Enzyme design. Structure first.
Site, PDB file in Angstrom:
ATOM      1  N   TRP A  44     -45.838  12.158  44.694  1.00  0.00           N
ATOM      2  CA  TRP A  44     -46.443  11.845  43.407  1.00  0.00           C
ATOM      3  C   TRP A  44     -45.902  12.820  42.370  1.00  0.00           C
ATOM      4  O   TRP A  44     -45.438  13.906  42.709  1.00  0.00           O
ATOM      5  CB  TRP A  44     -47.974  11.868  43.453  1.00  0.00           C
ATOM      6  CG  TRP A  44     -48.576  13.136  44.004  1.00  0.00           C
ATOM      7  CD1 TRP A  44     -48.735  14.326  43.346  1.00  0.00           C
ATOM      8  CD2 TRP A  44     -49.095  13.339  45.338  1.00  0.00           C
ATOM      9  NE1 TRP A  44     -49.332  15.248  44.184  1.00  0.00           N
ATOM     10  CE2 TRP A  44     -49.559  14.671  45.407  1.00  0.00           C
ATOM     11  CE3 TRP A  44     -49.208  12.522  46.474  1.00  0.00           C
ATOM     12  CZ2 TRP A  44     -50.125  15.218  46.576  1.00  0.00           C
ATOM     13  CZ3 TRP A  44     -49.789  13.067  47.646  1.00  0.00           C
ATOM     14  CH2 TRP A  44     -50.234  14.401  47.680  1.00  0.00           C
TER      15      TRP A  44
ATOM     16  N   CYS B  95     -38.517  22.353  45.609  1.00  0.00           N
ATOM     17  CA  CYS B  95     -39.729  21.542  45.594  1.00  0.00           C
ATOM     18  C   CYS B  95     -41.007  22.383  45.462  1.00  0.00           C
ATOM     19  O   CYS B  95     -41.378  23.151  46.372  1.00  0.00           O
ATOM     20  CB  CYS B  95     -39.826  20.644  46.844  1.00  0.00           C
ATOM     21  SG  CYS B  95     -41.312  19.628  46.802  1.00  0.00           S
TER      22      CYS B  95
ATOM     23  N   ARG C 131     -44.535  21.603  48.092  1.00  0.00           N
ATOM     24  CA  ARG C 131     -44.438  21.793  49.538  1.00  0.00           C
ATOM     25  C   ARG C 131     -45.739  22.133  50.278  1.00  0.00           C
ATOM     26  O   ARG C 131     -45.744  22.185  51.504  1.00  0.00           O
ATOM     27  CB  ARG C 131     -43.325  22.774  49.901  1.00  0.00           C
ATOM     28  CG  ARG C 131     -41.938  22.154  49.785  1.00  0.00           C
ATOM     29  CD  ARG C 131     -40.889  23.192  50.031  1.00  0.00           C
ATOM     30  NE  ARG C 131     -40.669  24.078  48.895  1.00  0.00           N
ATOM     31  CZ  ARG C 131     -40.053  25.259  48.988  1.00  0.00           C
ATOM     32  NH1 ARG C 131     -39.612  25.689  50.174  1.00  0.00           N
ATOM     33  NH2 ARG C 131     -39.844  26.004  47.903  1.00  0.00           N
TER      34      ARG C 131
ATOM     35  N   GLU D 197     -42.672  16.736  34.784  1.00  0.00           N
ATOM     36  CA  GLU D 197     -41.467  15.963  35.078  1.00  0.00           C
ATOM     37  C   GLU D 197     -41.307  14.820  34.069  1.00  0.00           C
ATOM     38  O   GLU D 197     -40.208  14.579  33.584  1.00  0.00           O
ATOM     39  CB  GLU D 197     -41.482  15.406  36.497  1.00  0.00           C
ATOM     40  CG  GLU D 197     -41.562  16.477  37.570  1.00  0.00           C
ATOM     41  CD  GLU D 197     -41.620  15.872  38.959  1.00  0.00           C
ATOM     42  OE1 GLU D 197     -40.531  15.616  39.524  1.00  0.00           O
ATOM     43  OE2 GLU D 197     -42.746  15.657  39.471  1.00  0.00           O
TER      44      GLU D 197
END
Ligand code: HEM
Ligand code: HEM
Ligand SMILES: Cc1cc(N)nc(C[C@H]2CNC[C@H]2OCCNCCc2cccc(F)c2)c1
Ligand SMILES: Cc1cc(N)nc(C[C@H]2CNC[C@H]2OCCNCCc2cccc(F)c2)c1
Ligand SMILES: C[C@H](O)[C@H](O)[C@H]1CNc2nc(N)[nH]c(=O)c2N1
Ligand SMILES: C[C@H](O)[C@H](O)[C@H]1CNc2nc(N)[nH]c(=O)c2N1
Ligand SMILES: [Zn+2]
Lengths: 402, 403
Positions: free
Chosen positions: A278, A106, A109, A283
């Protein structure tokens, strides 16, 4: 130097040592003979429980206190007489935040301390799961001003069925297998689409049809729930300067909400704990829209831009990908929906690395997942060495329930 | 025990069995992966490395177990037993050099592994002779822009004595001149080597693209300076196909990428000076050399010339500028008729190499972070390909800078 991994940033020349990795109690896939870092995929309970309770009491600065010792004693008495135990409300909140903090894949973070944790451990049917998930989506979406959230359903119980959300995300688009072998919609979702049809969904026939939820309470067949369309915020895609882009009829949904991962906290396993944040723009713009096994729109868009698609050295693929990514960022910004670009996101992640070095002595990070899928070396994370290891609490993959 | 290797674009699966031939440990353990780290933190040993290598050689010529094979193993055993070392026959050296290339996990150009010109320079005894060899290598490799892969192998390391070394990290690189205002003129990667050349009597230029001289070192002697004849060093002025102002940036790059600071290990023997060259993949130049923030760092200049909005990252000015630079590199080399490969073509050919090696050897050691190009990662097939990384021998390794 110290006997911990030395970690260098090759842009700035700065060095840290990772001492946090010594806290890992779970092996990854690598050995001294070979690195597999690029691959995608009661006595035991008690030690994991003790460890987590120690983590919780450290975090509130009451380590070794009588409240700490009494909580330990209470946990092992619970396990002694029942085979399991249950988390206090604040332990759950701490555990969910920590599982996010610990997630090596991730890039988001820096936000780990800001997570709204919904306790849904009293859920006892598929209908009630639906209510909770709808409330999560409403809260998280917040009409475009997105808020990180997780909803936690009851934990796994010995010889008793799991709570499971069958969808991999709360909002995803259907993929319909066509007679000519091709797919209409999202090819990633062909299996789940066909399962929704088996369980009585009347399918659409568009490229962007929102899937229904397939929800499972312990030991019962999954039940189908259509998300009311007013709850699913979507963004029509347009481009700032290329006027024809809007005419492509592309769109994406605002809320990325992972729903098939297992949240593990002190030996307890929450098989249904969907979480959402979000989007980072790549992506959608690079992976979802341009992957050859996804919507695969690169060539269509390059043709619209009048690029030479016959030769690799025109960089037609790179040029179309940039414009698609720009369209995503612009369209989300115009619609007032929270989104972060890969440059700002990776900058924030570098700040996070610095925070965590000071707070914990390191940060587990999976370099291949942190570095964005376009413009890799243009972001500061490309030049940053990273140590990858498994800490608990953690989110983990679990098998699909069918 | 043999890992499953999946391609996520296509759904196909292979199993790497080659990894079991690895005799050399990398930096990872079950506790933590260190795969993103750039650098790693006597008779009986040498003999078994030597035997393994000789076995590889005779196997490769389908003469495994023959008379020539047995007598050669005896020669090696006899020489190590008497002297503590041995020497390769030229054909063994040729096989070993190609194998080291084939085995190199960070190299995307390995489809070419079988096509390598090997110059045996193990009869070199002076920095002077090193220079002549390097010059011949460059001329051969450059071949007026029709680039040919080459390696030159200088004398092996020996127990009692200093190494043959090339101090330069590449045969051709541009100087970096540290300025009073703390900035760097030229290539910031090369400040230290530039200062060493000056300290060894080089009269410096003051441009952005000044070709460095060579600092070449024979055993236990001070290095000596040699200027490359400018006629040997092929360079490409950079222009853009559609943007006319781009040529006025005065940008240029050299044709020949030639690594000169790595150690070549064959059969237990170590070649501390063994420079090798191929041809460029364009992102090395357009993306890393010109756009890295700690290199030429031209992104912002180019973006302003393109009149992009630099005030905000979400205009994607960095991505847009980087694309045009990469395009300019490609166009300019193609125009100057100098061999170059783009990152799409190179990664497609690497996927073919992985398939070739799967059938030939049961796998291919590959470092995913290094193989995936620095722009447009997931737009290349190698992004979606899982890869297993490990150390096979013969090998190229890093070694400390000689100063
Ligand atoms: C707040 C904004 C966030 C951003 C921008 C963000 C970004 C990302 C990205 C880009 C990935 C890689 C996903 C992929 O390519 O498959 C990822 C993975 C992940 N995220 Fe975050 N995220 C955010 C919030 C959250 C939240 C709230 C949680 C949970 C509390 C979370 C937990 C995870 C986990 C567990 C993964 C790994 C999934 C896997 O291993 O495949 N993230 N995130
Ligand atoms: C023929 C065309 C070639 C191409 C297109 C090519 C491409 C590349 C690229 C892009 C890299 C990564 C470089 C970096 O970012 O630092 C690399 C590394 C490497 N190449 Fe190749 N190469 C070629 C020829 C060769 C030859 C002839 C050899 C030796 C015989 C070789 C051996 C290596 C080695 C050992 C590395 C790794 C260096 C390191 O670990 O830092 N390559 N190559
Ligand atoms: C919470 C959150 C925020 C954000 N920005 N982004 C996310 C990841 C979502 C969105 N965009 C991709 C999806 O990630 C899904 C989780 N991981 C999928 C990777 C995977 C797993 C198993 C097998 C595979 F082949 C691949 C989550
Ligand atoms: C033979 C060949 C062909 C080709 N296309 N490209 C190459 C790599 C060369 C050229 N372009 C980069 C350089 O690569 C040099 C090797 N890599 C340096 C990585 C490194 C970083 C920091 C500290 C270190 F010790 C090492 C070789
Ligand atoms: C094979 C490779 O590990 C795989 O394609 C990974 C690479 N990095 C990634 N990084 C992110 N963020 N998301 C992904 O799905 C992937 N896929
Ligand atoms: C820290 C990270 O491993 C380092 O920046 C690597 C990443 N991938 C790379 N890939 C290539 N081809 N060349 C490089 O120099 C690097 N740098
Ligand atoms: Zn590893």
């Amino acid at each position: 130097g110290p006997k911990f991994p030395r970690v260098k940033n090759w842009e700035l020349g700065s060095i840290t040592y990772d001492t946090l990795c010594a806290q890992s109690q779970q092996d990854g896939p690598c050995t001294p003979r070979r690195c597999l870092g690029s691959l995608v995929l009661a006595e035991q309970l008690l030690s994991q429980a003790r460890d987590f309770i120690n983590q919780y009491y450290s975090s509130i600065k009451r380590s070794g206190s009588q409240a700490h010792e009494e909580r330990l004693q209470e946990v092992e008495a619970e396990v002694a007489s029942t085979g399991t135990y249950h988390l206090r409300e604040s332990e759950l909140v701490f555990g969910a935040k920590q599982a996010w903090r610990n997630a090596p894949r991730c890039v988001g973070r820096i936000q780990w301390g800001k997570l709204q944790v919904f306790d849904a451990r009293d859920c006892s049917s598929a209908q009630e799961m639906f209510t909770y998930i709808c409330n999560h989506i409403k809260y998280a979406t917040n009409r475009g001003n997105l808020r990180s959230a997780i909803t936690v359903f009851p934990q796994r119980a010995p010889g008793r069925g799991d709570f499971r959300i069958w969808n991999s995300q709360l909002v995803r688009y259907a993929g319909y297998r066509q007679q000519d072998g091709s797919v209409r919609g999202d090819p990633a979702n062909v299996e789940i689409t066909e399962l929704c049809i088996q369980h009585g969904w009347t399918p659409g026939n568009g490229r962007f049809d929102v899937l229904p939820l397939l929800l499972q309470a312990p030991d019962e067949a999954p039940e189908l729930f259509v998300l009311p369309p007013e709850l699913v915020l979507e963004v029509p895609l347009e481009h700032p300067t290329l006027e024809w882009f809007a005419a492509l009829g592309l769109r994406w949904y605002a809320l990325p909400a992972v729903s098939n991962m297992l949240l593990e906290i002190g030996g307890l396993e929450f098989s249904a704990a969907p979480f959402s944040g979000w989007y980072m723009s790549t992506e959608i713009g690079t992976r979802d829209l341009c992957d050859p096994h996804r919507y695969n729109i690169l060539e269509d868009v390059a043709v619209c831009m009048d690029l030479d698609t016959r030769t690799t050295s025109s960089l037609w693929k790179d040029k179309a990908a940039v414009e698609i990514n720009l369209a995503v960022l612009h369209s989300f910004q115009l619609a007032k929906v929270t989104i972060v670009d890969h440059h700002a996101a990776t900058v924030s992640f570098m700040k996070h690395l610095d925070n965590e070095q000071k707070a914990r002595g390191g940060c587990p990070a999976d370099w291949a997942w942190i570095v964005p899928p376009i413009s890799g070396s243009l972001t500061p994370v490309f030049h940053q060495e990273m140590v990858n290891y498994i800490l608990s609490p953690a989110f983990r993959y679990q098998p699909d329930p069918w």
